[PDB]
Amino acid sequence: LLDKKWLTFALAIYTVFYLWVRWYEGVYGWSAGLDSFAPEFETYWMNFLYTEIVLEIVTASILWGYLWKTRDRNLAALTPREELRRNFTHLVWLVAYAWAIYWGASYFTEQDGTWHQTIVRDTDFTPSHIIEFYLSYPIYIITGFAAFIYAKTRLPFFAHTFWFMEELFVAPLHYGFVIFGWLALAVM
């Protein structure tokens, strides 16, 4: 009942995954990822690429496909309590989305930044490129889409006096979309 710690998943799910990645590149950025023309780079770094692309296409396929087909068909009548339960879960999506953006656009980007400063590149596919570009960006644009789609297919906003608040709660989580409605110009 209300908004659950699925939101806990949504936070840790990246954090474990990416902390594994940071370990992985920390240990192989040196030994393997130094000289691209060496066979250890093929196995530990190049293979990594096609592993993720496949996985990304696949997930993004099942993930968007999932939600779209499970789109709340007749939503004409579904309680205000769900129109609350929902633009909570929706928000969880948007939290995951932001967390994802954080890693992709702050963390892994300014890292690439440091990486460029310390090794003269051998490919357009440095460790930190395999990670910053082809693992990070896809992940968070996928999270992006999901958020959008969830909302589009789940919430019908997608076609004292504590008082003057308390009851402004029939079609509130309009707010939901003054904020997807203003990450808006915030992002670009």
Q: Please give the residues from 29 up to 68 whose contact with other proteins meets the rule CB under 8 A.
A: 29-30, 34-37
Minimum separation from the CB atom of position 75 to Zn ion (A): 31
Given Zn ion, other proteins, none, residue 158, with its beta carbon under 5 to 8 Å by kind, binds other proteins
Count Cβ atoms below 10 Å from residue 131 Cβ, excluding itself: 27
State the Rg of the chain over Cα: 21
- Interaction between residue 86 and other proteins (CB under 8 A): no
Nearer to Zn ion (CB atom), residue 46 or residue 95 = 46
The backbone torsions φ and ψ at residue 80, rounded to the nearest 5 degrees and listed phi first, read -65, -25
| Inter-residue contact 138 to 56 (CB < 8 Å) | yes
Distance CA 9, CA 161 (A): 37
Nearer to Zn ion (CB atom), residue 87 or residue 128 = 128
- Interaction between residue 77 and other proteins (CB under 8 A): no
- Interaction between residue 112 and Zn ion (CB under 5 A): yes
| Inter-residue contact 103 to 90 (CB < 8 Å) | no
Distance CA 14, CA 99 (A): 8
Q: Please give the residues from 127 up to 186 whose contact with Zn ion meets the rule CB under 5 A.
A: 162
Q: Please give the residues from 141 up to 180 whose contact with other proteins meets the rule CB under 8 A.
A: 141, 144-145, 148, 152, 158-160, 162-169, 172, 175, 177-180
